[PDB]
Design a protein around this ligand. Structure first.
Ligand SMILES: *[C@@H]1O[C@H](CO)[C@@H](O)[C@H](O)[C@H]1NC(C)=O
Ligand SMILES: *[C@@H]1O[C@H](CO)[C@@H](O)[C@H](O)[C@H]1NC(C)=O
Ligand SMILES: *[C@@H]1O[C@H](CO)[C@@H](O)[C@H](O)[C@H]1NC(C)=O
Ligand SMILES: *[C@@H]1O[C@H](CO)[C@@H](O)[C@H](O)[C@H]1NC(C)=O
Ligand SMILES: *[C@@H]1O[C@H](CO)[C@@H](O)[C@H](O)[C@H]1NC(C)=O
Ligand SMILES: [Ca+2]
Ligand SMILES: [Ca+2]
Ligand SMILES: [Ca+2]
Ligand SMILES: [Ca+2]
Ligand SMILES: [Ca+2]
Ligand SMILES: [Ca+2]
Ligand SMILES: [Ca+2]
Ligand SMILES: [Ca+2]
Lengths: 689, 322, 144
C-alpha cells in the first residue's frame, strides 16, 4: 500500500505500511516497466486488413494481447484512432487467418475515449496477471471497407468503389445486391437506393476488381459490419462494373452572404446555377436547409432581396418540408408546371450558426376554435400521392384517423390548404382509401372553411367518438396529379397517349423539348421499362382532351415526372400533331446469346434489372418467355446459368406457368422478394427464330 | 542467381509455410499479388518437395514491410527455378497489403477422405482434412465420375456409384472443394481440377456424398395400387426405403421402371388408390432417361438423397399389365 | 459462498468459503432488505381497472417493476389472490394509459401458487440486477 505523490526521491520515503507484516500473497507481486516510449507497438492481426482483427501489443520485443475485461467501444476508439483507421464500430471481426498464442496480457482500467494513444490511458498494467474467464480484445474500425462513388454528374450517383487498404477497386455486377446497395447509400449519407446499373454505365474502372460478395441483411450502417464471402477470381471484366443511383441528388448552397450560415438560396439543376423564389418557401424548409448545412436552426427568412439577385436563372421548385428532415433530398418537391415568380422574390435564410441547437415539437395541439415544430401533424395515406389519401392526425404520440360523420368539403378545404395541397375537390368517406389502424381521435368535425389548422375546428373532443374503422375520412386535393398512357385497346398500357391528371381533369402533354431522359422517366414511373421512344400520332384520338403542360425538361435523378421543370400549367385546346405519344421498351430481355431468341432471362422491376431462378423452371415457363418477346415456340429450358451469370437482384422465384399466360407476371411465383436463390441458378431459354 | 536460397517458415513443416528469400544477407517475405499456380509449382519444385496443393496469402500485414527480391514474377510453370522465367523487379516491390505469400506443397500436406453419416460404411457425406480441419464438398459439379474416384480412394465397392448423401442432415465447417472435375481414372479427388481451396459458390446445405455399392442392396417395387403393376414408386437401397420425386417424371422414364418390373409399357402416371402408404423422408432424384435403359440404375447421374422437393410429390405409375 | 441455516448469530459463524480477496467474475455484490411487512405495496397500473395492468411494486417508498423471468399463470395467481381480484386469466392487458419508468426491478424464483401473498415466495430479489432481454410483468385478473 505504498502511496507516493510522484515527487519523492525514493520509495521508502513515501507513505506505506509496516515493514514485514502484510496480508498479501506472493501471487500478487509488484513490478514496473520503464520506457523511452520508442519500443511500444500496436497491431491488429487476423481480420482481413490492418483495421480489423485481434489487438496485438509488442512492448520491448515481447508479444502479447489485451484482455477484454473492461473493453468497450470507448476504449476501442482510441486504438482505431491511434492506428489511423477511423472510429470503432464493433468489438468483433470476421476471421481470415489464425494468430499465434501468447502468455502475456495487457490490462486497462478505463479510458475517456479522447486519448491520442493507448499508452496515455491511466494505469494500464503490462503482465503480472492472468485472465482466464475473459478473452482477447477484438475491434473492427470504420476504415476496413470504405466505399465511394465516382463518375456521376449528380451528387449521389456513380461507380461503386471500395478501398482495400490504400487502393481502390471496382466491383462486378454479379456480386452486388439490393441489400448491399442499401448499406452503401446509407453509409455515404445518400438516402435510399433508387436503381442498380451494371455493365459500366458510368464508365469502366482501371486497376482492380475485388472478388468478394457482401452478405448484408440490410440494416447495417457500414459495409464493414457486413459479412464478406470470398468468390473465385477472374469471373468478371471491367465492362461489368456496377453503379448505383441514390435518392439525394439535390444541390443547394447559400451565396452572396456575409457569413456562410446566411445567404441567398441557390439550386443547381440541368447544369446551371439558379435561385429559388420566395413563393412556397417557409421556415420549415429553412430549418431543413440549415440542419443539412450544419449551421443549426433558421432565425428567419428575409423577404424581398436582402442579399440581392444574381444570375438570370430562376428555379421555380417547391419544397414541402415538415422541418424534421435532415437533408433537402428527403423533402417532397414538385417542379412541374410551377407558376412564374417575379425576379424580386428570391428565397433567403439566416441560420443561427450555433450548430448546437436541436429543435423539436413544442406545447400541444390545443383543440378548440381560435424554433419548435407544430405539435399536431397531418398526413394523407394510401392515395397514390401527397395530395390524396386517408386523413390522419398525430396526437399523444400516435397516428389516428378522423370519422366519416359530418365530413364534407368545408372540412376538407382546411385539410388541403394546411398541407400545401391547394383546394379540395372531393371529400371521401366510408373507407374509400382503405381501413385505418389506430385510435379515432376526432369525430363530428364542424368547420367554416376559413380556419388554419384542423384542431381549430369544433369537435366533440380528443378521442371522444362512437365510430368504427370502416368509416374513415379522406380528401382529394386540387394539386393532385396522376399519369397514364391511353391507347384505343386499353385505358392503361405501355404504349399510347401521355395524359396528365391535374385539377380533377385530364389533359395531354406537348411534344416540344422531349428528350431521351424525359421519355425514360415516364416509362420508369409507370412501371413499364427503363427507356422508351416517341412514335408519331396514332390513327384515332379519344375525346381530344385539352393540352395541360408543355416544354417538360427532366434532369438526371428524378424517377417521377412531378420533379421535372416545365412551363406553367395552361389548359389549351391543341391539335393531335402536338400531343405526345410514347411507346416503352419491353419489360423482358434475353441476353448473352448467339441469337436474339436464345439467352439469359432478365426482367425489369422496381427500378433495376433482375433475373429468374431456375428452380421449378420447365418448358411451359419457357413458352411464356418466348411468347412475350414475340419469338417462336421454345426448344429447351436451360438450367444452372448455362449462358452466364446474371446482374442485379433476383426478382422471380418458384415460377409455375400454366403455359398460356401472356406474361411471366401472371404466373404464380415468389414475386419481388429476397429468396435464397443465388445468381449461379439463373435460368435461360432457347426459342425458334 | 544461385546465391539466393528459399526457405519456408511459420508452417510447422519444411514443405508448408511462408516463403522467405535471402538477398544481400537479409530475409524477405514475398508479396502475394501476381502469384500464379505456376509459381507455386516452381517454388515447390525448387525445394524438390513435390507439387503444390495451395497458395495462401497468409498474414498480409503492411506494417514491417520488407523489400521483396522476386515480385510480380511471370512464368509458364515449366521452369525449374523462379529466376529462369521473365522478371519484373529485383529487390523491390509495388504491392498492396498481401504480405507473406505462403505455399503448401503436396508432400508436406496431410490430406484424407472419409465417409460419415451413412447407413453403411460406403454411404453418407464426404469430408476432406485440409490442414487439420474437416470440411465438406459442394455438390455443384458432382457426377458419377467424381463418385467413382472417391469410392476407389475410400476402399469401397465400385460396381455401382451413386451421388448424394443418404441421410446426412448437414455439414459444419469449411467447404474446401467445389466443382471437382474428375475424368474417372484419377487416384484421388484432389488430384483432379477444382476451384481453389476455400472458395465456394454455395452453402453448407448442398454437401456432396456418394453411395458405393456392388449391388443387390437396391430394390424397386410399386405399392398402394390394385396390383404390383400400378401404384406409387417405392425404392429401398441398403434396406433404407424411399420414394422418387417427380421433378422430371414423364412417360419415358416411367417406361423404364415398368420394363424393369416386367409389367409392360407405361400408360398413366397415376393410379386408383386401394390402400395407403407410409411416408418416407428420403427422396430419389433422377435427371432424365432415354427409355432404352434396362433399369433405373443404368440411367446417368441418379442422386439418392441430398435434396428435398416440398412443392413436388412422389412419383406414381400404372403399367399395361395391370 | 456464505452458507447459513438462519439461526447463526453472525455471518462469519456460519460456514463460508474463506477470508481472502475474491474476483467474483460472474457474480455481484451482496445486499439485504429488512422490513416489518408494512412498507411493501403491490398494485396494477395502466389497465383500465385495478385488476388489470402492469405489476408495480413499491417497497420502502421506492417504485419499481417485476421482471418476467419466471412469470406465468402460476406465479400471477398469487398476485391476483393477494389483491383480491379473483384468478389470473391472461398475462397481458388492454392499454388505457401510459406508465412511468422505474430503474429498480424485482426478480422471482418460483411460487407454488398457493401462497397468500407475493412476499411469501422463496428467494425473491429486490434490485441488484437489470433486465435487458426481458420486460415488465403484466396480468389480467378474473374480476376485471
Ligand atoms: C479528454 O477529456 C477529459 C475529460 O473531459 C479532459 O480532462 C482531457 O483534457 C481531454 N483530453 C484531451 C487530449 O482533449
Ligand atoms: C370526386 O368528385 C367528382 C366531381 O363531382 C366526381 O366526378 C368523382 O367521381 C368524385 N370522385 C370520388 C373518388 O369520389
Ligand atoms: C440416417 O439413418 C441411418 C439409419 O437408417 C442412421 O445410421 C444415420 O445416423 C442417420 N443419419 C442422421 C444424420 O441422422
Ligand atoms: C438407346 O438410345 C441411345 C441413343 O441413341 C443409344 O446410344 C443406346 O445404345 C440405346 N440403347 C439400347 C439398349 O439400344
Ligand atoms: C402449497 O403446496 C405445496 C405443494 O403441495 C405444499 O408443500 C405447501 O405446504 C402448500 N402451502 C400451503 C400454505 O398450504
Ligand atoms: Ca415549404
Ligand atoms: Ca358515417
Ligand atoms: Ca363539416
Ligand atoms: Ca359521431
Ligand atoms: Ca414451373
Ligand atoms: Ca447445387
Ligand atoms: Ca464433375
Ligand atoms: Ca447461503
Amino acid at each position: 500500500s505504498v502511496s507516493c505523490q510522484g515527487h519523492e526521491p525514493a520509495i521508502w520515503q513515501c507513505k506505506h505500511h509496516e515493514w514485514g507484516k502484510h496480508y498479501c500473497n506472493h501471487n500478487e507481486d509488484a513490478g514496473v516497466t520503464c520506457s523511452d516510449g520508442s519500443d511500444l507497438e500496436l497491431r491488429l492481426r487476423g481480420g482481413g486488413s490492418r483495421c480489423a482483427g485481434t489487438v496485438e501489443v509488442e512492448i520491448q520485443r515481447l508479444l502479447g494481447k489485451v484482455c477484454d475485461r473492461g473493453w468497450g467501444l470507448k476504449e476501442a476508439d482510441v486504438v482505431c484512432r491511434q492506428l489511423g483507421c477511423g472510429s470503432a464500430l464493433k468489438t468483433s471481426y470476421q476471421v481470415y487467418s489464425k494468430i499465434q498464442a501468447t502468455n502475456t496480457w495487457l490490462f486497462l482500467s478505463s479510458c475517456n475515449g479522447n486519448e491520442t494513444s493507448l499508452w496515455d490511458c491511466k494505469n494500464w498494467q503490462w503482465g503480472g496477471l492472468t485472465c482466464d474467464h475473459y478473452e482477447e480484445a477484438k475491434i473492427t474500425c470504420s476504415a476496413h471497407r470504405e466505399p465511394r462513388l465516382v463518375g456521376g454528374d449528380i451528387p449521389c450517383s456513380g461507380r461503386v468503389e471500395v478501398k482495400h487498404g490504400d487502393t481502390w477497386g471496382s466491383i462486378c455486377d454479379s456480386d452486388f445486391s439490393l441489400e448491399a446497395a442499401s448499406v452503401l447509400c446509407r453509409e455515404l449519407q445518400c438516402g435510399t437506393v433508387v436503381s442498380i446499373l451494371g455493365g459500366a454505365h458510368f464508365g469502366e474502372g482501371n486497376g482492380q476488381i475485388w472478388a468478394e460478395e457482401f452478405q448484408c441483411e440490410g440494416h447495417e450502417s457500414h459495409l464493414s459490419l457486413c459479412p464478406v464471402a470470398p468468390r473465385p477470381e477472374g469471373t468478371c471484366s471491367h465492362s461489368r462494373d456496377v453503379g448505383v443511383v441514390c435518392s439525394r441528388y439535390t444541390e443547394i448552397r447559400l451565396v452572396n452572404g456575409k457569413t456562410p450560415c446566411e445567404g441567398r438560396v441557390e439550386l443547381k439543376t440541368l447544369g446551371a446555377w439558379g435561385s429559388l423564389c420566395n413563393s412556397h418557401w417557409d421556415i420549415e424548409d429553412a430549418h431543413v436547409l440549415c440542419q443539412q448545412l450544419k449551421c443549426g436552426v433558421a432565425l428567419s427568412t428575409p423577404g424581398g432581396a436582402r442579399f440581392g439577385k444574381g444570375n438570370g436563372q430562376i428555379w421555380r421548385h417547391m419544397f414541402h418540408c415538415t422541418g424534421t428532415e435532415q437533408h433537402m433530398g428527403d423533402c417532397p418537391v414538385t417542379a412541374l408546371g410551377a407558376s412564374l415568380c417575379p425576379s424580386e422574390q428570391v428565397a433567403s435564410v439566416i441560420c443561427s450558426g450555433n450548430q448546437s441547437q436541436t429543435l423539436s415539437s413544442c406545447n400541444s395541439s390545443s383543440l378548440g376554435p381560435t424554433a419548435c415544430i407544430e405539435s399536431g401533424q397531418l398526413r394523407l395515406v394510401n392515395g397514390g400521392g401527397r395530395c390524396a389519401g386517408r386523413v390522419e392526425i398525430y396526437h399523444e404520440g400516435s397516428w389516428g384517423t378522423i370519422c366519416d360523420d359530418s365530413w364534407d368539403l368545408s372540412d376538407a378545404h382546411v385539410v388541403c390548404r394546411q398541407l400545401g395541397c391547394g383546394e379540395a375537390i372531393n371529400a371521401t368517406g366510408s373507407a374509400h382509401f382503405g381501413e385505418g389502424t389506430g385510435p379515432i381521435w376526432l369525430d363530428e368535425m364542424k368547420c367554416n372553411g376559413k380556419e388554419s389548422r384542423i384542431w381549430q375546428c369544433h369537435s366533440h373532443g380528443w378521442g371522444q367518438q362512437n365510430c368504427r374503422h370502416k368509416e374513415d375520412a379522406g380528401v382529394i386535393c386540387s394539386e393532385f396529379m396522376s399519369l397514364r398512357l391511353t391507347s384505343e385497346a386499353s385505358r392503361e398500357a405501355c404504349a399510347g397517349r401521355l395524359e396528365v391528371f391535374y385539377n380533377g381533369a385530364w389533359g395531354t402533354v406537348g411534344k416540344s423539348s422531349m428528350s431521351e431522359t424525359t421519355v425514360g422517366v415516364v416509362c420508369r414511373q409507370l412501371g413499364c421499362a427503363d427507356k422508351g421512344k416517341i412514335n408519331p400520332a396514332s390513327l384515332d384520338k379519344a375525346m381530344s382532351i385539352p393540352m395541360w403542360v408543355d416544354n417538360v425538361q427532366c434532369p438526371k435523378g428524378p424517377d417521377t415526372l412531378w420533379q421535372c421543370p416545365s412551363s406553367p400549367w395552361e389548359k389549351r385546346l391543341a391539335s393531335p400533331s402536338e400531343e405526345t405519344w410514347i411507346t416503352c421498351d419491353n419489360k423482358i430481355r434475353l441476353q448473352e446469346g448467339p441469337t436474339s431468341c436464345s439467352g439469359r432471362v432478365e426482367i425489369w422491376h422496381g427500378g433495376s434489372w433482375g433475373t429468374v431462378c431456375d428452380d421449378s423452371w420447365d418448358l411451359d415457363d419457357a413458352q411464356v418467355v418466348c411468347q412475350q418477346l414475340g419469338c417462336g415456340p421454345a426448344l429447351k429450358a436451360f438450367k444452372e446459368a448455362e449462358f452466364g451469370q446474371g446482374t442485379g437482384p433476383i426478382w422471380l422465384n418458384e415460377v409455375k406457368c400454366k403455359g398460356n399466360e401472356s406474361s411471366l407476371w401472371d404466373c404464380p411465383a415468389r414475386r419481388w422478394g429476397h429468396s435464397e436463390c443465388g445468381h449461379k441458378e439463373d435460368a435461360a431459354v432457347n426459342c425458334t427464330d | 542467381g544461385s546465391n539466393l536460397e528459399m526457405r519456408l517458415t511459420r508452417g510447422g513443416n519444411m514443405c508448408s509455410g511462408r516463403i522467405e528469400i535471402k538477398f544481400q544477407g537479409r530475409w524477405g517475405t514475398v508479396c502475394d499479388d501476381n502469384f500464379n499456380i505456376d509459381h507455386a509449382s516452381v517454388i515447390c519444385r525448387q525445394l524438390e518437395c513435390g507439387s503444390a496443393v495451395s497458395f495462401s496469402g497468409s498474414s498480409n500485414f503492411g506494417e514491417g514491410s520488407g523489400p521483396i527480391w522476386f515480385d510480380d514474377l511471370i512464368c509458364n510453370g515449366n521452369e525449374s527455378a523462379l529466376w529462369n522465367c521473365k522478371h519484373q523487379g529485383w529487390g523491390k516491390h509495388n504491392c498492396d497489403h498481401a504480405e507473406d505469400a505462403g505455399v503448401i506443397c503436396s508432400k508436406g500436406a496431410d490430406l484424407s477422405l472419409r465417409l460419415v453419416d451413412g447407413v453403411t460404411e460406403c454411404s453418407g457425406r464426404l469430408e476432406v482434412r485440409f490442414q487439420g480441419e474437416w470440411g465438406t464438398i459442394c455438390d455443384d459439379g458432382w457426377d458419377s465420375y467424381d463418385a467413382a474416384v472417391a469410392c476407389k480412394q475410400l476402399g469401397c465397392p465400385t460396381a455401382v456409384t451413386a451421388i448424394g448423401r443418404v441421410n446426412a442432415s448437414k455439414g459444419f465447417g469449411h467447404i474446401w472443394l467445389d466443382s471437382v472435375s474428375c475424368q474417372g481414372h484419377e487416384p484421388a479427388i484432389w488430384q483432379c481440377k477444382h476451384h481453389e481451396w476455400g472458395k465456394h459458390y454455395c452453402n453448407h446445405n448442398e454437401d456432396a456424398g456418394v453411395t458405393c455399392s456392388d449391388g443387390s442392396d437396391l430394390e424397386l417395387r410399386l405399392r398402394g395400387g390394385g396390383s404390383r403393376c400400378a401404384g406409387t414408386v417405392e425404392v429401398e437401397i441398403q434396406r433404407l426405403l424411399g420414394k422418387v420425386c417427380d421433378r422430371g417424371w414423364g412417360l419415358k422414364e416411367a417406361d423404364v421402371v415398368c420394363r424393369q418390373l416386367g409389367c409392360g409399357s407405361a400408360l398413366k402416371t397415376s393410379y386408383q388408390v386401394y390402400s395407403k402408404i407410409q411416408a418416407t423422408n428420403t427422396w430419389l432424384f433422377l435427371s432424365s432417361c432415354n427409355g432404352n435403359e434396362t433399369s433405373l440404375w443404368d440411367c446417368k447421374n441418379w442422386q439418392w438423397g441430398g435434396l428435398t422437393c416440398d412443392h413436388y410429390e412422389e412419383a406414381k405409375i400404372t403399367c399395361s399389365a395391370h
